[PDB]
Symmetry: C3
Subunit: 212 residues, 3 copies
């Protein structure tokens, strides 16, 4: 078979290209190539994809499409009685590092499983023990700090915890924490930290994120 090919030099929207293909061929399910720059395309860069429908009625078209771009981004969309919905772009991720680096291990570098330049955002996870126990537990779970990668020398994960069981004599206590990290190529470094108690705090996971 012959997938639908849509060029900018055709001077035809994506939507009219799909209509014309279905008029000409009667196909309801088929693949397609759309050159980057085609008006109404699921995306800006070139893409390929799959159009799915069951009735080739181009006056009231009902169908969906699933397209992938040159950077791997996934875009899905629909047409409902010949009205085209806004294409939906998915995010993606890759787990780059997991382990347990004490906040006290400043100036230490570890590897990422891919280069940080393949990501626009990142999630850095930290795992804490609060100054005091609250209902017998000082553990916090593992907390996400999400950043946009803006070229900073330091990505700063800084926050606070309340902990302790209130008595009439002693309210809960408050504490501040920080860990700063940096990225370079396929590596990351724990640059700085501040801890307000004697317990060990860790960086435990780094996840690369794309939101194309």
């Amino acid at each position: 078979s012959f997938p639908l090919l849509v060029y900018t030099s055709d001077s035809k929207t994506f939507q009219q290209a799909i209509i014309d293909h279905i008029d000409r061929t009667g196909q309801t399910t088929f693949t397609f190539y759309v050159q980057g720059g085609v008006s109404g395309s699921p995306m800006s860069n070139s893409c390929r994809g799959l159009f799915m429908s069951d009735t080739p009625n181009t006056s009231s078209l009902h169908g969906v499409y699933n397209a992938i771009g040159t950077d791997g981004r996934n875009v899905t969309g629909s047409v409902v009685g010949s009205n085209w919905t806004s294409p939906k772009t998915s995010p993606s991720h890759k787990e780059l590092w997991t382990g347990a680096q004490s906040f006290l291990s400043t100036g230490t570098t570890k590897n990422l499983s891919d280069d940080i330049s393949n990501y626009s955002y990142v999630e850095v996870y930290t795992t804490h023990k609060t100054t005091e126990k609250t209902k017998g537990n000082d553990n916090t779970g593992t907390i996400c700090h999400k950043f946009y990668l803006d070229g900073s020398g330091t990505y700063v994960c800084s926050g606070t915890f309340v902990s302790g069981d209130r008595t009439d004599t002693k309210p809960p206590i408050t504490e501040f924490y920080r860990v700063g990290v940096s990225f370079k190529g396929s590596t990351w470094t724990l640059v700085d930290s501040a801890v307000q108690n004697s317990k060990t705090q860790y960086v435990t996971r780094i996840i690369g994120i794309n939101m194309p």
Copy 2:
């Protein structure tokens, strides 16, 4: 290739429709339409998509599907023997604004690239300079604040930073920050803020999010 059509009126689950279809037709790769409200459908709204199996053996079915909603929501799923996995529903996003609005620019309105009513969640990104430098630098990177859009007049991005290098006698210092933002149609406003140094802090990105 015959399409599978599944209506609520059929009193048949999505999974049984699939089984029945492959038993009736012998076809192991086909497209489908599943009316909104069908039991065990990949999503609650109406969808269309592709089922792909290894063989027409419905007693040990091995296969995948992609289903896309009337609003372009994307779901993938699988079958292993008589065990259907839960549907994996994808999120989507759109960048609505990027720039660099100072926290001190309260009352100022800027444009979004899409109407906020098209999103259920939103990420607001802020970019800071802490009061003191830490290991040679006061930048924080660009920090995400994610909200569910609940109709509030103000979405509040408020946190703390630790900054400065500890000496033998002087600890790091702490600061608080706040920026509050609002959304209306295809616009946003920087409503209020609190900064505790003379350095400039910015709102830099707004990303609309759907988690259908």
Copy 3:
């Protein structure tokens, strides 16, 4: 039509190249067994490859694959530069409602077992101590966790509020709510509120990032 097994001792990328070279097919479906070097995912998958031409020494193409657990990966090759595979996340809303921070020791149901997720987003909805420019609302704030087996997932933060005057700076407050999960349930375990206004947990979304 393309089947790749760990026993073939070839990478996903070389298997695609071989398939195109052998058959001249540029669009085809595939099965890749869990463990194949360079596969879009670590578990077994099935999907669709689409390429521009059969020039395998400068391949331009894309793929969409689905794993045995339903995970979805998409990717591309541009002039035989294979770009990092783009793994989608997934989610399920597990609970929505309005549970006061003061309702400690209370349990509610989730729509699915927490063991089916690796991450969770817990949403909290606040009223700050003071009104700021006429309003003490915060919106509904996400706290995302990796589910590490902790007995408490601690949502804790601060708010500045109040209108600055000559006399009276803005005020600061700390808050905390701790939650736990067991099977298809969650419990509001502990809290700290520094005013008399009602604070809520409002949403719990289960998240997978395979």
